[PDB]
């Protein structure tokens, strides 16, 4: 029974992802997030190893939730008559990276480097587990303010990773790549790298570079804030119009702008506490 295992607190948010409540596991007072999704509102379905029909999101969370990482961990899930309920880790204290950037403005490059590095490691972990997130953005990144660790959330638009073309997409359009805008086709890794370029610009400039389809496909990156030449170069590489001109995850992490990253704890003590 879900009602007896978790004490339910206030609504944390709701939208296309469902309704998410703050919660506490009665067993050990572990903070949790309790996410409700209506079955009728579920587009992609999958099967666990046991062959139970579950939302794809449950399938993807199980694949990445083994061990520790910069990914939100699924602790449990339940099926109800008209919905699924997901029990997720809840960092405390926490702020999502969208609210963080709204309040602080453009991040210092030292802080954006540490955050972007951790997002890179989190996305590599998803890809190693066979999972493509497809909705990388600041809204889907939580900051553990005490530990200085970033956690990727919301796999409800993701898919199994594959090397063939995707022709479907339900993530965030202003982070989607020009090949999706023009042709409704993309490959998983190179589209992820585009969304990472958008995220990095967002971090160092205080907001995303593009709002309109014409800007996404136009291939022009105007920097509205002072950004180092090294960081500009990495961003423009991630945002190459041609997918095959974009860096691999290895080339990003070997980029000169990415060297000498802060540890998470150093990040918290210098920039968050």
């Amino acid at each position: 029974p879900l009602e007896s295992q978790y004490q339910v607190g206030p609504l944390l948010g709701s939208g296309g992802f469902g309704s998410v409540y703050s919660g506490i596991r009665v067993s050990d007072n572990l903070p949790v997030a309790i996410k409700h999704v209506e079955k009728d509102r579920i587009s992609d379905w999958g099967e666990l190893p046991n062959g139970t029909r579950v939302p794809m999101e449950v399938v993807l969370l199980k694949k990445v939730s083994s061990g520790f990482s910069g990914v939100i961990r699924l602790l449990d899930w339940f099926e109800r008559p008209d919905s699924f309920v997901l029990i997720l880790e809840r960092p405390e204290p926490v702020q999502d990276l969208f609210d963080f950037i709204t309040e602080r403005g453009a991040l210092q490059e030292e802080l954006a480097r540490s955050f972007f590095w951790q997002v890179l490691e989190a996305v590599r972990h998803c890809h190693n587990c066979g999972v493509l997130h497809r909705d990388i953005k600041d809204e889907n990144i939580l900051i553990d303010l005490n530990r200085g660790e970033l956690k990727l959330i919301d796999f409800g638009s993701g898919a199994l990773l594959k090397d063939t073309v995707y022709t479907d997409f339900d993530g965030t359009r202003v982070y989607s790549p020009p090949e999706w805008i023009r042709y409704h086709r993309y490959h998983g890794r190179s589209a992820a790298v585009w969304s990472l370029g958008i995220l990095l610009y967002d971090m160092v400039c205080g907001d995303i570079p593009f709002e309109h389809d014409e800007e996404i496909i136009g291939g022009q990156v105007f920097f509205r804030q002072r950004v180092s030449s090294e960081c500009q170069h990495l961003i423009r590489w991630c945002l190459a119009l041609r997918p095959s001109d974009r860096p691999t995850f290895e080339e990003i992490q070997n980029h000169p702008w990415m060297q000498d990253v802060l540890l998470p704890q150093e990040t918290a003590e210098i920039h968050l506490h």
């Binding site: 969208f98 709204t102 809204e139 409800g156 638009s157 993530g171 965030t172 982070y175 907001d207």
Partner: peptide, 9 residues
Amino acid sequence: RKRRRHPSG
């Protein structure tokens, strides 16, 4: 300049 969230979909 207006900064805003962008719902998925």
